[PDB]
Amino acid sequence: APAGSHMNIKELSLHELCEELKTPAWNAPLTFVGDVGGTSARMGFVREGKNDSVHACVTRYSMKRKDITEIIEFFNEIIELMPASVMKRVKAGVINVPGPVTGGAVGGPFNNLKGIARLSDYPKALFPPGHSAILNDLEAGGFGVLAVSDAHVFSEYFGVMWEGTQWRTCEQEPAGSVIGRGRCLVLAPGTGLGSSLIYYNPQHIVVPLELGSQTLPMRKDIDYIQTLHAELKLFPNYENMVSGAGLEFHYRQVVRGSRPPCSAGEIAKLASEGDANACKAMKKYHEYLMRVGSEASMALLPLTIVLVGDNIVNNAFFYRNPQNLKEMHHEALNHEMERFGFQSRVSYLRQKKLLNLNLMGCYRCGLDLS
Amino acid sequence: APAGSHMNIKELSLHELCEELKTPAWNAPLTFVGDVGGTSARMGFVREGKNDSVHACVTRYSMKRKDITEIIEFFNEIIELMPASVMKRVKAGVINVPGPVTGGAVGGPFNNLKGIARLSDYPKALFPPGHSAILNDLEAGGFGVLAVSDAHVFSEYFGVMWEGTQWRTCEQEPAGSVIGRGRCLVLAPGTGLGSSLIYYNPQHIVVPLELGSQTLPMRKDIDYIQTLHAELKLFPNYENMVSGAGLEFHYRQVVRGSRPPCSAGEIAKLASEGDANACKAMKKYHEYLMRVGSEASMALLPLTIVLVGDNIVNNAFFYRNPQNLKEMHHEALNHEMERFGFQSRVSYLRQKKLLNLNLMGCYRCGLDLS
Ligand SMILES: Nc1ncnc2c1ncn2[C@@H]1O[C@H](COP(=O)(O)OP(=O)(O)O)[C@@H](O)[C@H]1O
Ligand SMILES: Nc1ncnc2c1ncn2[C@@H]1O[C@H](COP(=O)(O)OP(=O)(O)O)[C@@H](O)[C@H]1O
Ligand SMILES: OC[C@H]1O[C@@H](O)[C@H](O)[C@@H](O)[C@@H]1O
Numbered sequence: 001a002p003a004g005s006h007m008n009i010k011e012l013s014l015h016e017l018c019e020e021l022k023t024p025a026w027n028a029p030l031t032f033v034g035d036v037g038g039t040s041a042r043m044g045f046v047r048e049g050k051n052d053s054v055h056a057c058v059t060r061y062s063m064k065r066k067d068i069t070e071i072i073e074f075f076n077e078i079i080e081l082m083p084a085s086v087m088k089r090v091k092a093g094v095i096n097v098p099g100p101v102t103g104g105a106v107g108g109p110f111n112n113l114k115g116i117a118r119l120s121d122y123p124k125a126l127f128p129p130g131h132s133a134i135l136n137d138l139e140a141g142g143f144g145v146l147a148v149s150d151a152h153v154f155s156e157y158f159g160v161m162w163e164g165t166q167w168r169t170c171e172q173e174p175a176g177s178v179i180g181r182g183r184c185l186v187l188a189p190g191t192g193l194g195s196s197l198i199y200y201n202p203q204h205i206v207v208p209l210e211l212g213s214q215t216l217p218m219r220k221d222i223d224y225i226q227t228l229h230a231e232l233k234l235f236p237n238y239e240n241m242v243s244g245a246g247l248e249f250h251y252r253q254v255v256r257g258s259r260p261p262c263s264a265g266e267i268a269k270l271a272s273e274g275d276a277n278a279c280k281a282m283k284k285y286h287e288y289l290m291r292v293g294s295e296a297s298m299a300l301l302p303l304t305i306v307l308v309g310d311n312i313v314n315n316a317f318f319y320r321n322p323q324n325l326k327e328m329h330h331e332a333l334n335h336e337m338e339r340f341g342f343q344s345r346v347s348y349l350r351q352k353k354l355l356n357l358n359l360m361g362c363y364r365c366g367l368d369l370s
Numbered sequence: 371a372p373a374g375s376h377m378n379i380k381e382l383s384l385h386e387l388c389e390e391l392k393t394p395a396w397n398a399p400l401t402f403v404g405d406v407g408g409t410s411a412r413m414g415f416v417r418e419g420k421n422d423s424v425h426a427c428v429t430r431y432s433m434k435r436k437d438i439t440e441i442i443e444f445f446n447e448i449i450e451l452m453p454a455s456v457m458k459r460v461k462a463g464v465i466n467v468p469g470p471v472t473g474g475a476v477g478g479p480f481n482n483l484k485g486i487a488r489l490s491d492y493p494k495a496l497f498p499p500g501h502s503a504i505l506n507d508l509e510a511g512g513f514g515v516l517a518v519s520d521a522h523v524f525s526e527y528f529g530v531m532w533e534g535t536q537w538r539t540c541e542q543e544p545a546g547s548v549i550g551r552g553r554c555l556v557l558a559p560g561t562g563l564g565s566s567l568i569y570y571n572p573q574h575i576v577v578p579l580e581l582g583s584q585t586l587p588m589r590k591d592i593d594y595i596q597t598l599h600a601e602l603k604l605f606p607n608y609e610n611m612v613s614g615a616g617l618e619f620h621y622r623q624v625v626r627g628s629r630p631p632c633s634a635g636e637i638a639k640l641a642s643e644g645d646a647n648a649c650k651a652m653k654k655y656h657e658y659l660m661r662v663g664s665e666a667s668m669a670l671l672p673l674t675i676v677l678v679g680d681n682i683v684n685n686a687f688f689y690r691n692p693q694n695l696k697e698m699h700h701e702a703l704n705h706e707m708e709r710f711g712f713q714s715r716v717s718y719l720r721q722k723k724l725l726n727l728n729l730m731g732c733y734r735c736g737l738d739l740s
C-alpha cells in the first residue's frame with residue numbers, strides 16, 4: 001500500500017527488453033540506468049507506475065574484457081535496437097561504477113577495471129545532457145537506501161543487528177523502521193569494500209567515501225598483517241581483509257595447506273553448512289569488517305551503520321548465529337574511544353532481503369536530474 | 371572593496387564591549403557568538419555593516435574550572451551587564467566547542483573539559499529558540515573558510531603549499547584564489563587535531579569529522595608507535611602524534627634526556643630560531659600530519675586540504691623552508707594508493723594570515739538560523 005514501496009526489477013535478454021518496452025505499460029518517461037560492476041553490468045530503463053511504484057527492466061552484460069570503456073559498446077548495441085518511439089521517452093541517464101567519481105562525470109581509476117569512465121564519451125540518446133551522471137556504486141547504493149526509507153519499507157529490507165546508544169536519543173520510531181535523523185554509514189563488502197556516508201541536517205546528502213583503501217591499522221595482529229603484506233607486496237588496507245580475496249586469504253591461513261584453497265563463494269557455502277574451517281575464516285572476515293566500522297564510528301560519528309549487498313543477505317546465517325553476533329558486537333566496540341562510548345552510540349543494521357539498491361539509486365538520482 | 375571582505379574582530383573587556391554595543395553603529399540585528407576553547411572562550415556579538423562587512427566584538431573569559439558548564443555563568447554575566455536595548459537585537463546565538471556535537475544541541479565529551487554542552491541549558495536571551503546552535507570547532511572553522519571564499523579574499527588568508535594534480539583539471543582559476551568546486555578538508559593542528567570536510571555538489575555543506583581520534587596505522591614506525599603506546603597505555607591515535615602533547619613527545623624522543631623537556635610552544639619557538647633538536651621534533655610532528663593527510667586524501671577524496679589555526683600561521687617559518695616543504699610533500703604521497711595517483715590529486719594550502727575562522731563560521735551559520 002505505502003507509496004513507492006513496490007519495486008520491480010526484471011532482468012531480460014536485450015530482445016525481450018526491447019519487446020517489453022514496446023508494450024503499452026511502458027509508454028511513460030524512461031530513465032536509462034546502469035549498475036556497472038567489476039564482473040557484470042545490468043543496463044536498462046526504469047519508469048514510475050501507479051502508487052509511486054518503481055518498474056525496472058535491465059539486461060545483464062558480462063564485463064569479460066575488464067574494461068570500463070566496454071560499456072560504450074553496450075550503450076551502442078542498445079541504441080542499435082530500440083525504436084525511436086522508445087528512445088524519445090528517455091528523460092535521464094544515470095549509471096554507477098565501482099570506483100571514485102569526480103564531477104559526476106569521470107570515474108576511476110578502478111582496482112580491477114582498465115580505463116576511466118567518461119560521461120562526455122557516452123551517447124546522448126541514453127545520456128541527455130543536463131540530465132545525466134556517473135555515480136560511484138555506494139553513492140548509488142546510498143540513494144537506494146534513501147529510496148527504501150522514503151517508501152516506508154525500511155524494516156522490510158533491513159534487519160537490526162544491535163541498536164546503539166544514540167538512537168533512543170533522537171528517534172521516536174523503532175530502530176530499523178526508518179533511516180533515521182542522523183548520519184548513515186553504508187558499507188558493502190564484495191569484490192571490493194564500498195562505503196558512503198548519508199549525511200543529515202537542515203536534508204540527506206549522499207557523500208561517497210573510500211574507507212576501504214585506507215591503510216589497515218594493526219591492533220594485536222602485526223604478524224597476520226605482515227603475512228598479507230608479504231603476499232601482496234603492499235601495506236594491507238581494509239579491503240585487502242574484507243573482500244573476496246580477503247575471505248580467501250583468511251581461509252588459507254586457517255587450513256594452512258591441509259585443505260585445497262577455495263573461492264570466497266565456496267568458503268561461505270561451506271560456512272553455511274557449518275564447516276569449522278570456513279566458519280573460522282568467516283569470523284576473521286567479519287572481525288576486520290567490525291574494525292572498519294569501529295574506526296568509521298569514531299571518524300564519521302554515524303547514527304547507524306548499514307551493511308548492504310547480496311553477500312550480506314546471503315550471509316544472513318552468519319549474522320543470525322547469536323554467538324557470531326555477540327562477538328561482532330564485541331569487536332565493533334574494541335576501540336580506545338569506546339571508553340567515552342563513541343562505538344556504542346552506533347546502531348548496526350544489515351540488508352535482509354534482496355534488492356538492487358544501486359539501480360534504485362540511479363533511478364532516484366535520475367528523478368532529481370529532471 | 372570586495373563584498374563581505376571587511377572582517378574586523380575586536381576583543382575588549384566586557385565593560386568596553388557593553389559601551390561599544392550602545393554606539394549608533396551597533397543598533398542593528400546581532401548574532402551572539404562564542405568561540406569556546408579548552409583554556410579560554412571569546413564570546414560576544416556580530417553585526418553586518420556596509421558592503422557586507424563583518425564587525426565582531428568579543429570578550430575573553432578564562433576556562434578556569436576546565437568545565438564546559440562554566441560558560442553558562444559567562445552567558446548570565448553578559449546578560450546581567452548588557453543594556454536591554456542590546457538584548458532585544460539578538461536574532462541568533464551560535465557557539466562552537468572543542469568536541470563532537472549531535473543535533474547541533476549537545477556537545478562533548480571533551481578531552482580537557484568536564485561535562486557536556488547543552489543548548490537547552492543556555493539562556494534564550496542569547497540563544498533565541500529555533501535560531502540557535504552549538505557547532506563543533508572545525509564545523510565552525512569550515513563555515514569560516516567558506517565565508518572567506520565568498521568574500522573573494524581566499525588568497526589573502528591562505529597560501530598554496532603545493533598544487534595537486536587535480537586542480538588544473540577542473541579549475542580555471544589559480545590554486546589558492548578560490549575554495550574550489552570540490553571537497554575541502556580542513557585540519558587544525560592545535561592542542562588537539564580538528565578536522566571537517568566541506569563537501570560540494572548542487573551546494574557546500576560542512577561535515578564535522580573526528581579523524582584525529584582514529585587509530586594511527588603503523589608504516590615503518592612500529593617501535594615509535596609502541597613507545598608512545600607504553601607511555602599512554604592506549605594504542606596511539608593521530609592526535610597523539612599531531613598535537614601539543616605529540617610535539618612534546620617528538621621533542622623528548624629527539625633529545626633522550628640530554629635536554630630538559632619543553633612545551634609545544636617552547637619547541638616551535640626554538641625551531642623558529644633554528645635549534646636542530648626542535649626542528650627535528652617539528653619534522654616528525656609534520657610527518658604524522660602528512661599521514662593524516664595521505665590517508666584522508668584517500669578516504670575523503672578532497673580536491674584541497676587546508677591547514678588552519680593560529681599555530682599554522684605562526685609556524686609559517688616551517689612551511690616556507692623549501693626542504694621542509696619538499697619533505698612534507700614526499701610524505702603526503704607515501705601511501706600505497708599513490709600508485710593510482712590519489713594522494714597527488716590533492717592541493718595543500720595553509721592559513722598564512724591570522725583570522726578567527728571559528729567566529730566567522732558562528733556568524734555565517736547564525737545568518738542561516740535568522
Ligand atoms: N557469501 C559470500 N560472502 C562474502 N563474499 C563473497 C560471497 N560470495 C562471493 N563473494 C565475493 O564477492 C564477490 C561478489 O560480490 P558482489 O558485491 O556480488 O559483486 P561485485 O563486488 O563484484 O560487484 C565475489 O566475486 C566473491 O569474490
Ligand atoms: N607553534 C606551535 N606549533 C604547534 N603547536 C603549538 C604551537 N604553539 C603552541 N602549541 C600547542 O597548541 C595548543 C594551543 O593551540 P590552539 O589551537 O591555539 O588552542 P586550543 O587548541 O587549546 O584551543 C597548546 O597545546 C600548545 O601547547
Ligand atoms: O565496489 C565497492 C568499492 O570497491 C573499491 O575498491 C572501490 O575503490 C570503490 O569505489 C567501490 O565503492
Ligand SMILES: OC[C@H]1O[C@@H](O)[C@H](O)[C@@H](O)[C@@H]1O
Pocket residue numbers: 468469470481506507508562563564565580582609
Ligand atoms: O579541538 C580540536 C579537536 O579536538 C579533538 O580532540 C576533538 O575531539 C574535536 O572535536 C575537535 O575538533
